Amino acid sequence: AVDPGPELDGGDFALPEGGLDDDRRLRALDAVDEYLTRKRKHLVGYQATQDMQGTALDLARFMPNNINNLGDPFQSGGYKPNTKVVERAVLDYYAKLWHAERPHDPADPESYWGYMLSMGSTEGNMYALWNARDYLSGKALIQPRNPNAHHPVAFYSEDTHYSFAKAVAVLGVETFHAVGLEKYADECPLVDPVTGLRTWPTEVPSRPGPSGLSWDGPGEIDVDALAVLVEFFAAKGHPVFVNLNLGSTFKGAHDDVRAVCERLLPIFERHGLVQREVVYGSCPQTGRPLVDVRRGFWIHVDGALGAGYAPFLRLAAEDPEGYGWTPEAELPEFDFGLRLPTAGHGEVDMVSSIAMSGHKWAGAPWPCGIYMTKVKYQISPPSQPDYIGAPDTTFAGSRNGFSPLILWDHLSRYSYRDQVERIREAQELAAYLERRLTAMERELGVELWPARTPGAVTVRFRKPSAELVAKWSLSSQDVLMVPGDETTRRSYVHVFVMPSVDRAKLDALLAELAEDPVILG
Amino acid sequence: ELDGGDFALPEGGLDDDRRLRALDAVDEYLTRKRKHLVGYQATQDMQGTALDLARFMPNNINNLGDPFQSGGYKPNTKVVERAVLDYYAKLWHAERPHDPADPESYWGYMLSMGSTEGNMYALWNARDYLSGKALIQPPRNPNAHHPVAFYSEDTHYSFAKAVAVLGVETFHAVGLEKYADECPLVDPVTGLRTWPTEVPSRPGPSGLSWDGPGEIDVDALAVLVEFFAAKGHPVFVNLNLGSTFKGAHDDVRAVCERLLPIFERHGLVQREVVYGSCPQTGRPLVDVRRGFWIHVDGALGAGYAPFLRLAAEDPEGYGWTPEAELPEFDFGLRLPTAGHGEVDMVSSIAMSGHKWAGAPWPCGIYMTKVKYQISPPSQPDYIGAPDTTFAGSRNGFSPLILWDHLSRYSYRDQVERIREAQELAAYLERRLTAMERELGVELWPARTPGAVTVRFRKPSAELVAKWSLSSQDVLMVPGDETTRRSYVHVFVMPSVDRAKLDALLAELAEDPVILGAP
Ligand SMILES: COC(=O)[C@H](CCSC)/N=C/c1c(COP(=O)(O)O)cnc(C)c1O
């Protein structure tokens, strides 16, 4: 019934040999603006903040500059039109927020190192897995018999973003599923709840919902299942990479990072993964190999979304009277401050890396974000180029130096208290949306299948008409309610309550949903 | 310089006055530096694009997924992206429109990093294509699945990075591991058959590559490729079209002419590749692929080389005969086969938008053909469009930047921009040698014919920092630290005019390092 409005017409944008005159150019740019403006005002289906008027006014002035943050953020280098001083300020802010040790100091192994991304969190997840692959496999670091010792195995839940399947293929890192099928075909330690067979699952199971299966579950990793699987491979001598989702793509779930770490640390200690000798080369002499001591596990937090708000929710949880708000759900401790005792290695700082997207919670006009780790994990760069004047420590070559300005401007405009208010309002509006959807089910006598993981800023429900989906940029996911069986398909959409989503917007969507031909049946 | 104290972000935020003071300091710094940058291959002038496109900064634009389907994230510019890709497809003699049913048609996408993303993607695509991974769904020999990478010593550092990321083996690594005593090349310094770390570039007056043009040695490449091709390995070759330090153009046409007979001899034009086995019986499923992949790293040069070649083809029509010949390099390069058929030789091209065009952030293009596309790493529901790209979320502002640029200039205007830069690079070289004679000092000026960069002796740190001169140290005899020389270069981009060069030259003539030159 509803109108998403006209798409852009390719004929208006065709670029001829002779160029376009000023009138045709302006007509085309006006068409783009009219399209983008309509869509941005109605987007509620993706985890991307849409309002940034203040930053546009503040930062339009920088568009004439070909800014390039080429090389490591902690040295200018030769390309002087760079914003690395701003980039370091942004990195410092998040280092504090995530309880990392600051300042960055190459002589302090425990201090943070990180950089701003030129893609989105895909770059941060790729970098994390590259960094972890090399660290766990014995490649040389920056700072000074078991056949599986150099064969890391990757673990993550079924709710993990597709960037990991991509990163694993790019980097040649083997998942527990691939290694299971290849080397350990009949030894899967988990029983499949559908078939009762010991078949290796493709990802670590997520927690079950009312169905007994993960499709209607919260989207959080099953800690028990993870621990069983990690023990299996750790006992075989494999080092371990674990990715944990802090604000998962479809359900906005938060893996219980503290619970995972508590449950895995004894496994790591039992199997000699807290501190182990690693050979990182050899030379022709009576003696040969070079050895150093490393951990044999790497825990990465994919906070693409959640690393931007979770610190603020946790601040309120710590001082609910001070912020005038008690969050309804507990968000897990997840950051560089998470430290656990051991039987005989002292306290262990559990997380090795975090990724976050700037175009998610904060909002940006293009993809950006942060990768952060510690100095002690940095890998020797792939080469030493004289011509950038700064080391090649990043995934990108040339880097977006406008993104530091975007995030700096944002962060400068809000206090911690203001940031707590933004996550509070989103949490409360997500709860409101869930309430209104069930009230709609009762008023109209229709099924909407609404679902919201406690503490998530997204609510899922039955997919409406294609036109409504297109108007409001609703993201879609199909599930089979019984894995394998194509007849059990349900189509869901979700709404992400970002800081640019307010009550009026949700009420306008809900009014259209109540008259939608698919919803009504 | 910028003081970090002005940019520290307190828990409580900054007020409007502190915020504006800091942003003004950034602007004053960037503006001074942008107006004097001449040492990097980055166009610094886009005032028109800022006026046209600042209006879009309020939008969180995202070109999530493949460019040729919209997907669910509606604030996207994929219509514009496709117009830009169509323009470069035509410019590079690719087949358009993109059509998933036409194996010969182009496929490509706009990059969210710079050309690093395009080179990484190229090598990923090649690795998987050459190793027998499944291709995208349309609408004996122990080395068959072990591709070997070849590129010159002037290749950008993104390749060393990409090789390490992707686990692709270079000819040097494979040579050392499998064929340690069989190197077919003799080292010109030592006389030993030691595997070189990259394919040699052409020698200069020294007899060594440090003062050479920066172009790959086609003979040496052919010898190396034949060696591995004869062993049964498939082959990836990267060729530099506007190299990082010397601005050299590998002779793509000469390389292709020299390699095709090698590929024909060793069964690399059409070969059966096993891509798994049948679900029931473990029996090799097969399709026919080429066993080579030629990539052109045109980060810089793919943006101007088409226009110079336009003028070379019609010099009276454009009023300019380019002094240097730039090689045919693009998707239109087709050679006759032994049987009097035709083979299209180039598989992929990368270009950066922040180089010749100019942009406010890194961007660019990767382009290949439909016949080379690999099946996406997975098929999720929630972006709408297939995951066919290196990035996930993609910069949809960059399409607007390049569309705006391309719409403003005719082919003739673009020919004028490369003409002016070629002529100013020649002027700079003339002025530097005149300065040597006037002052009685050696500046070691060097310009590869047809390059838009000139190299010379590193001046003072103060001048280097003022003009953002990029630096390179070379050893004039490999492995001897006593033969080190420090060079800088100047890149004559469209934002570099005569007045700017004359101002630089005036400072160089009074520079203490230049005047103090032993
Ligand atoms: C379908 O929606 C998505 O895939 C969005 C990107 C679009 S909203 C900004 N999320 C990307 C994402 C990513 C990848 O981030 P990007 O590279 O910025 O797309 C990594 N991890 C998690 C947990 C993510 O949710």
Ligand SMILES: COC(=O)[C@H](CCSC)/N=C/c1c(COP(=O)(O)O)cnc(C)c1O
């Ligand atoms: C010393 O300067 C450089 O490395 C510049 C990037 C800065 S100028 C835009 N060149 C990058 C470059 C790259 C990498 O491109 P980016 O990822 O955009 O840095 C790839 N290939 C060639 C032939 C290149 O010259």
